């Protein structure tokens, strides 16, 4: 399973 | 023994040819188990191994949503990277990410990973402490500052020590028939005369799982590192792998050469010779 890492560069 | 789960992201810009393509593949050890392609007809996370088909519709929905949000995230990442490197919008660029966890035979976390690349070069990587970052350059340092402020490492660490190991433990149990079975290599040595005074000895390993293997030729018990032709371990397409190693040897000296094979599926390393 993945998780959402939503923070961009 | 020990096991790994890894997800591989590739986001590729393609100016004049639509929005950047986003692809994810997930592996447990050397077994592909899930994929996602933003260019799919109706993009979603798809099973690629029998043991993952067990997961209910909720899993697939949740997993699909992550990838669909990632498509948008990595499009923004690509735009941002252009600015950070002062690059024109005319060129195609690639961001890659590989993240996941390794567990021991007891299923405990051995270590977590989260590494990113830009155009095939290191960009930023979570350190082994799962708390701090290594940035490859001044552009990645800007991401590092943002990520430090946003506590990204803490969210990574929570995943790596929790869901990553928990889901991998479940996958290992569900796929125990295969993920917990090593297939030893089937091995042989071939002989091909090059000329009257030179011959090729080629040591083959076929049908093995997992991919990790060592093949080495010794002459009079001395490793022939510099003189061995070693091909990249290659997928047979039925889950197993293949590899060979070859030396050119003087005619009449074939018996001074031994092939050595190490593989987790072998109770002990193997020694092979040319069997004329």
């Amino acid at each position: 399973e993945e998780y959402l890492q939503a923070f961009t560069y | 023994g020990s096991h790994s789960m890894r997800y591989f992201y590739t986001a590729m810009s393609r100016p004049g040819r639509g929005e950047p393509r986003f692809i994810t593949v997930g592996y447990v050890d050397d077994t592909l188990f899930v994929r996602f392609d933003s260019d799919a007809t109706s993009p979603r996370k798809e099973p690629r191994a029998p043991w993952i088909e067990q997961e209910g519709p909720e899993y697939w929905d949740r997993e699909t949503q992550i990838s669909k949000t990632n498509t948008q995230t990595y499009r923004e990442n690509l735009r941002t990277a252009l600015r950070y490197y002062n690059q024109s919008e005319a060129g195609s660029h690639i961001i890659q990410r590989m993240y996941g966890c390794d567990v021991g035979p007891d299923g405990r976390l051995l270590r977590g990973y989260d590494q990113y690349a830009y155009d095939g070069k290191d960009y930023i990587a979570l350190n082994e402490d799962l708390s701090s970052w290594t940035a490859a350059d001044t552009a990645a340092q800007i991401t590092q500052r943002k990520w430090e402020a946003a506590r990204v490492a803490e969210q990574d660490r929570a995943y790596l020590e929790g869901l990553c190991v928990e889901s991998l433990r479940r996958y290992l149990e569900n796929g125990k028939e295969t993920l917990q079975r090593a297939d030893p290599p089937k091995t042989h040595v071939t002989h091909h005369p090059i000329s009257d005074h030179e011959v090729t000895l080629r040591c083959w390993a076929l049908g093995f799982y997992p991919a990790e293997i060592t093949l080495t030729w010794q002459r009079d018990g001395e490793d022939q590192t510099q003189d061995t032709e070693l091909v990249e371990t290659r997928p047979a397409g039925d889950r197993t792998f293949q590899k060979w190693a070859a030396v050119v040897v003087p005619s009449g000296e074939e018996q001074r050469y031994t092939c050595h094979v190490q593989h987790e599926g072998l109770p002990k390393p193997l020694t092979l010779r040319w069997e004329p």
């Binding site: - | 690629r48 690639i94 890659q96 990249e232």
Partner: protein, 99 residues
């Protein structure tokens, strides 16, 4: 920077004339990811070749497996033809049942 593909053409199982098998072309070590790979039977492109989902190694370089069902015979010649941005001309690698 750009990295040129490694190319291997080989069969899934040991080749046995008149016996159905899989012809594989494994391309690895390349960057960027765009790559053109054809499997050829007697110099002509085999239709409907499949390939693996794009993935990459710890060094970020990509790899792909291209593959088609095939029945090797004595007479039939097989090859892989690969083009990549790093290649000024397409590379042909002949299948050799001993490689």
């Amino acid at each position: 920077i750009q990295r040129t593909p490694k190319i291997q053409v080989y069969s899934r199982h040991p080749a046995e004339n008149g016996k159905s098998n899989f012809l594989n072309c494994y391309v690895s070590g390349f960057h960027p990811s765009d790559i053109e790979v054809d499997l050829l039977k007697n110099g002509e492109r085999i239709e409907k070749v499949e390939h693996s989902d794009l993935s990459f190694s710890k060094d970020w370089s990509f790899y792909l497996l291209y593959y088609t069902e095939f029945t090797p015979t004595e007479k039939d010649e097989y090859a892989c033809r690969v083009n990549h941005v790093t290649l000024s001309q397409p590379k042909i690698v002949k299948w050799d049942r001993d490689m």
